Amino acid sequence: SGFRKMAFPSGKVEGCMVQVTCGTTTLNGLWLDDVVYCPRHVICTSEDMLNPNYEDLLIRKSNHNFLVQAGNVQLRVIGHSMQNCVLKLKVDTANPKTPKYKFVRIQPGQTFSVLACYNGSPSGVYQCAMRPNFTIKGSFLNGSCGSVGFNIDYDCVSFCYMHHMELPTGVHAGTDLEGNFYGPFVDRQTAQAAGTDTTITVNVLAWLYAAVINGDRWFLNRFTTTLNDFNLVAMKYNYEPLTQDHVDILGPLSAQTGIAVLDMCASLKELLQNGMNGRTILGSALLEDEFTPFDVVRQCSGVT
């Protein structure tokens, strides 16, 4: 019973968080095996951030200029390299708490948990989604850079995000663990506007199935629709177009509830056209799009 915006347990990621200082800039690093991963803008001064030439700035840096502290103890840096927008600091010690892990580049609409950190220490954990405009609506302050986004399959942590920057609109941008930014963002202090933040339709449908499973059924109607009819409505409301791939992934939810995907699409269509009329669905007065079909299945089935 009940449905919550739930994050993965953060313990396995907490054991990886370290503090990286270069010059007077301190941010978070991710220590897996004998490598510490951190945003390359750690080498920048606020002056450098306007038009940084990271290759040129990195030439002035040596292994001893990167101060890596894991808890209250210092790690010895025996190598450094830049891979896209991340720095990989080879340390002389393998992280004893390194969990089984993968580096994955997620697609827009996918969700993950963020372990927000400051000075290498965790402050909190929350669930995010990679928006269709490749930004994330997180909660990050100065010093939070290097905090990571991740998913967990039983004992394997799939790192998908590393926080790099706050856009002038208060939304967030970052890279995968190979240093490649999601979206067109660049690590520089230049105004970069985000594109249209469309609603993740397949996620809203999954959350509507979760509402049905949990007893919120007032929005179920006597209608059906087609993928083409639904998508005409979705385009009008800045929702992502629904494909047969989305319908397929909603299959287990449709089977669990006995509500055909296109019937749920018609309920969503009426909710978009008529609004909630002061009502709520799973304690929300708006259509939630940050639960994937997999998240709804996982939460509703108790996967650990």
Ligand X SMILES: Cc1ccncc1NC(=O)Nc1cccc(Cl)c1
DSSP lists the bridge partners of residue 31 as 36
Number of residues assigned to the chain? 304
Residue 100 contacts which entry, a second copy, ligand X, none (Cβ below 5-8 A, type-dependent): none
Per-residue b or e along 93-127, where b marks 16 or more CB atoms closer than 10 Å to that residue's CB: eebeebbebeebebebbbbbbbbbbbebebeebeb
Enter the tokens of residue 109. Answer: 């609409």
Enter the tokens of residue 301. Answer: 């089935």
Q: How far apart are CA 258 and CA 220, in angstroms?
A: 12
Q: How far apart are CA 221 and CA 211, in angstroms?
A: 14
Residue 164 contacts which entry, a second copy, ligand X, none (Cβ below 5-8 A, type-dependent): ligand X
Segment interacting with a second copy (CB under 8 A) among 29-37, 116-124, 223-231, 253-261: 116-124
> Of 59 and 193, which has the nearer Cβ to a second copy?
193
280: contact with a second copy by CB under 8 A: yes
Strand order in the sheet with 86-91: 73-75, 66-70, 17-22, 25-32, 35-39, 86-91, 77-83
Segment interacting with a second copy (CB under 8 A) among 2-10, 76-84, 179-187, 244-252: 2-10
| Least separation in angstroms between CB 52 and ligand X | 8
Residue 118 contacts which entry, ligand X, a second copy, none (Cβ below 5-8 A, type-dependent): a second copy
Residue 178 contacts which entry, a second copy, ligand X, none (Cβ below 5-8 A, type-dependent): none
Amino acid (one-letter) located at 15: G
Residue 41 contacts which entry, a second copy, ligand X, none (Cβ below 5-8 A, type-dependent): ligand X
217: contact with ligand X by CB under 6 A: no
How many residues at the interface with ligand X, by CB under 6 A?
A: 14
> Quick check: helix, strand or coil at residue 294?
helix
Could you confirm whether 80 is annotated as catalytic?
no
Per-residue x/- marks for a second copy, 121-150, CB under 8 A? xxxxxx----------xxxxx-xx------
Interface residue with ligand X, options 24, 53, 72, 142 (CB under 6 A): 142
156: contact with a second copy by CB under 8 A: no
Q: How far apart are CA 274 and CA 266, in angstroms?
A: 12
Segment interacting with ligand X (CB under 6 A) among 70-78, 87-95, 183-191, 214-222: 183-191
Neighbours of 69 (CB within 10 A): 16
Could you confirm whether 145 is annotated as catalytic?
yes
Q: Tokens 């007077």 correspond to what residue?
A: 24
**Contacts of ligand X in 22-61 (CB under 6 A):** 41, 49
Question: Shortest CA distance to 173 belongs to which of 201, 195, 200?
Answer: 195
Contact predicate 10/91, CB 8 Å = no
Strands (E), 119-240: 121-129, 148-153, 156-166, 172-175
192: contact with a second copy by CB under 8 A: no
For the annotated catalytic residues, the residue numbers are 41, 145
Binding site for a second copy (CB under 8 A): 1-12, 14-15, 115-119, 121-126, 137-141, 143-144, 166, 170-172, 214-215, 275-276, 278, 280, 283-286, 298-304
